[PDB]
RNA sequence: CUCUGAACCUGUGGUAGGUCAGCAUCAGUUUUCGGGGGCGGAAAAAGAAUAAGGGAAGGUGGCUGUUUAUAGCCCUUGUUGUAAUACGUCCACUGGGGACUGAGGACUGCGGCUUGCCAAGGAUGCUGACAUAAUGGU
RNA sequence: CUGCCGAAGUUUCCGGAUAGCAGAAACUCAGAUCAGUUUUAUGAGUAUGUAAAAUGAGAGUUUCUAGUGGGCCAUUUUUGGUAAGCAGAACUGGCGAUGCGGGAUGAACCGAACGUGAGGUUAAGGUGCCGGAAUGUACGCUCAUCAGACGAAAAGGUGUUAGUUCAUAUGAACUAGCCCUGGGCGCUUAAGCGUACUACCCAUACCUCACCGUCUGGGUUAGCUUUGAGAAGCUCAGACGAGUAGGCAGGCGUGGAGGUUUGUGACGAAGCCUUGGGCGUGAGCCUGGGUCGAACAGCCUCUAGU
RNA sequence: AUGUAUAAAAAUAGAGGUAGGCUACUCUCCUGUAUCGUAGAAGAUGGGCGAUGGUUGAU
């Protein structure tokens, strides 16, 4: 439907592929996208399953970070040995956790890449971050730590913001051309 | 023409009809009327010249 | 504040295409809003124009317009085909249009 | 979608037989060309009855008498594999006599393979008694306490803001 | 050409394929 | 003669001109007013509702 | 009256880009093993009769009309019914001398020059 | 006298071509939404309403067992009925939206209205702007 | 240069004479015959041949005259085989003369056979992204820690899924399916597999139209004010369009010759140069500008060291 | 460019808000088709009334 010129997308259970196709095609529509929390992608099957598929692909430059894993997808599922793939793969920015400029910023969420609604209850599925901690990243402990940093700066801003919406939704009502005119459904 | 024409629609209605009201009375009397086969038949090709 | 946007926002996708033929005579057209093959039936026939702008100006203008209408929709997703007055060029892929509403039939 | 349709046929009269004898059949098929086809593959599998030397007399399409009733049908088949030779019963519940044959066409395809050739339906029969029932998911099905979790149904409007609540 | 095939006598018996 | 091939499924005027009987036709002619008997004996129902 | 060019880039010779030696002009390709010939896909076009112009508007130029040599007066002459259909052209060879006397004459019985203006000035 | 659209004055009279656009009324092709109606199908099956009878349930009341209660359900007839709907089929029944084409060049013909008129042997009207750029070409 | 026809690649006798295939001419015919046709029935042994109904097409010649006179693959039939494979013949078409959509790619696989185009609709194959098109619907099966997706392979499984049957809620024996063991990115209540139903994508294919050409069938002279008689013209209609060898027709260009243009040229011939313009399907032709300095061209015919 | 407008986290198979004193509460979710913003020669000139507030620019 509607889109926006930047979009930041927070990958926090979304499916690796799901996603990638989704922002692949995106990104050939010219649109920009950035997605953040690229540590917390989530792949269907063993944590086992993937380990193996990414030893196999250890035995090229082998990135570990999870978000030029991420981009390793995207990558592919873009022409990039043509100039039109070349300028779809700098339009997109991947980045662990959430860096202060995508802070305080809107994240949309794609649900059709979204696990909940996508993987069968009880099925077993490993995380990326998680996933990429034994195979050569190290940064897992210290990006969780500014993680929640984050979030309690950002609980508390929600907290102001959600003390200062009392006091209009109050006045809401209080106003009595609200109750006047309501028969147009607002 | 014209009467042609009329009276060979006319034909086809009673045609119609009749063939509905034979199948109704045996369905109502139990027995089992078959209706005539067709002599005419349109045929389409369907498959290349290769 | 609110500018004017008497027209509706769009994306030029592709041509008219199979897996190794083009055809440029036909552009494909999403139509940001519309979702579906029905809903595409309302943009039938609107005019479509791509804007740009090229540094040599002409008339004191620097605003280049080629115009278009949409023909009919491409798909089940709401994308629609339009046809311009020149060929869009292959490099638009993914730049934006707009979809007037006229000519109107509501 | 399959319809049930009743089809008579018998053979044609000659001098050796005056009258011939009357042979009905039930069977499913989408269209009534499948259905008279398939009957002529029984009779002659069966009564080895040529068609050529036979007709069919009466077609009807069958309507359910009761679709606004959940009823539980016991359906018969016989298996064409490798080994060629197999017959299985199995129990769905459902409201319409098609809707358990097109139920029962999905889990053959689904589990041995098989074909709508290959499957000849013998006999579909309702099996009112709750004691008749063979079948355990049936049988938990026929309980006065039937309350249960929604089964998960995951479901352009790309970019959703919120997380969606995905919840009852 | 269209004829008619009486029940009397000769009702229709119901067959199932052989097991 | 004939330049250009009409349908006269579309052109009103050149169905005229072939079938000089449109112009009195009565498709649709109410046949069952008032009667509609229903015609399905006993015997008929029985063998329908079989098995 | 509209004139319809089925096609307007030139039939080029097959490889006649890749050497100096091979001229432009078309020449039918005789390889057997060649591409060009069994009309491949990415292949060159060929001259085939079906690009052939509409027979009415062929020899027409753009402005509708048909081009007629003309080498001295008594050739422009020719064209005082023809006006409408024809344009006169004054061939490469004729001096400026004859050049002006056919303008002049041209005008006079209204034909249109497809190059009056050759080999002269103006003198208002 | 006639003629010279003959020169000029007086006309302030009229009528005004090429490229690119917009719309309307049409014709050919086509695509996509509807509305109404006839007929067939067990003259749909259901179902509601509905006067009854019988039965059992995964059993209401009474008390798992029980039989309409202090909930009801199923079956059968009856039932309004000539029901409705779905589906199939048909209408020389009708209302819109979109796109691509305009070949031919006096009149002939086949038709429909009422000599004339027409959607009937292939596009014409009404406008503009730019032209002194647009349209193109290289 | 263009256009129109267009094989065969092999019977048979034996380097061949035939024939076949493909054209030319003259004949006689559409009230006559014919067919990689289907029947009917007679017989004969489900088929078989013959004789006489349907369907389609107007048919039969005679004469002489180019090329071919290899095979590959595939289908079916096959005889023996024999580590197993395979080999051997025969049967039949396709390619070989043939591009196009799909098949990741690929010459043998699936569709489809070709004038130049506009629009529409499809085939085969497809619709997560690369990629045009549903991250469609409704059921199920599958968890792999090598699935799947496009021979050790038999089987085993404290592996499942549905389970059936038999014993007395359980257990045993079994019934199959799938997994484990024995194009890319990525996908796992699928973007996997099987089934059913809608929608959608696009080939040179199909339909409508325009245009080119060819073939075929007509019309056209007391040459009517429709004037449209280069009758070698004009005009109307329909069908058709791959192509090697080869056959045939019409055109483009070059040197010289006869005739002609009461032809072009020092106010600039010829030549050359040019991101100038135009014409022709093409060979080619016309032209502007620049350069240049003495000759040259169109048309009919003739000619060739073209 | 054409509103170049929108900051919870979190489960989802339950969470958040709301309130009482982590134990007992309640309400909402079932997406954003929401919310903010939007009237004027793209937005004029005055008279006002009414806010005497709001919208903001400038440092």
New binding site residues.
Partial sequence: ??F???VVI?A??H????????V??QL?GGQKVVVVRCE?LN????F???K?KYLA?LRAFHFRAPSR?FQ?????????K?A??QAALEHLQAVEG?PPPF???????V??????????????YCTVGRLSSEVGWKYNDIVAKL?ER??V???????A???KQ?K?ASA?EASPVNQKLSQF?? | IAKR?EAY?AEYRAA??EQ??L??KA??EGNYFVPHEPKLIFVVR????? | ?????L?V?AKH?????????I?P??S?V?IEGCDS??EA??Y??K?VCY?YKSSKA??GSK?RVI?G???????????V?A?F??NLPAKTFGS?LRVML??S?I | ??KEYQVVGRKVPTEHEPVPKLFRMRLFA?NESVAKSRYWYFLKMINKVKKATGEIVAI???????????KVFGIWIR?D???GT?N????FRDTTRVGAV??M????????????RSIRILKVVEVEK?EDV????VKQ??????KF???????K?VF????????? | KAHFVSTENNEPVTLHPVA | ???????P???????????????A????????????????GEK??SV??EN | ???????????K?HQSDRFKRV??????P?G?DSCV???????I????????????????????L??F?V??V??VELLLMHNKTYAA????????????EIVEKARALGVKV??A????RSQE
């Fill in positions: 439907s509607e926006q010129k930047v927070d926090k259970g499916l690796l592929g799901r996603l990638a196709s989704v692949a095609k050939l917390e792949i269907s099957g063993h086992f399953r993937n193996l692909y894993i390793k997808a995207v990558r592919g599922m873009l022409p990039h043509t039109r793939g959430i802070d305080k910023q809107k994240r949309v969420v649900p059709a890449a979204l696990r909940v609604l996508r993987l069968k209850p009880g099925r077993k993680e984050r979030k700066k950002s609980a508390a801003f929600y907290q913001k959600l003390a009392k209009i809401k459904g607002y | 024409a629609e119609e009809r509905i009201e199948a109704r369905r109502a369907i498959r290349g010249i290769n | 504040a609110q500018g004017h946007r027209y926002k996708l592709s041509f008219q295409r199979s897996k190794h033929v055809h005579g036909t494909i999403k093959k029905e039936q309302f039938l026939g005019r804007v002409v008339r605003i115009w209408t949409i023909a009919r929709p491409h798909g089940n997703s709401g994308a085909r046809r007055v020149h934006s006229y000519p039939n | 979608a399959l989408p009807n399409e069958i309507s359910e008498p009761k679709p606004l009733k959940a298996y594999s490798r080994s197999h299985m019963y199995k129990e097109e139920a066409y999905a889990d053959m395809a689904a589990r041995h393979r098989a074909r709508f709750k063979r079948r355990n998911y099905l026929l309980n006065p306490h039937l979790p929604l089964p998960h149904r995951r479901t409007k959703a803001p919120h997380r969606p609540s995905t919840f009852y | 003669a004939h330049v250009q091939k009409k349908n499924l579309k052109n009103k005027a050149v169905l005229s001109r072939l079938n000089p009987y449109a112009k036709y009565k498709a649709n002619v109410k046949i069952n007013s008032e009667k509609t008997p229903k015609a399905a008929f129902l329908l509702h | 009256v509209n004139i319809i060019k089925k096609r307007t880039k030139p039939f010779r001229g432009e002009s078309w020449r039918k005789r057997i010939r069994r009309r491949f896909r990415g292949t076009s060929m001259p085939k009769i079906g690009y052939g112009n509409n027979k009415k508007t062929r020899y027409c130029m753009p402005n509708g048909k081009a040599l080498r001295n008594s050739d052209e004054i061939a490469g060879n004729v001096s400026a001398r004859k050049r002006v497809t190059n203006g050759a080999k002269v």
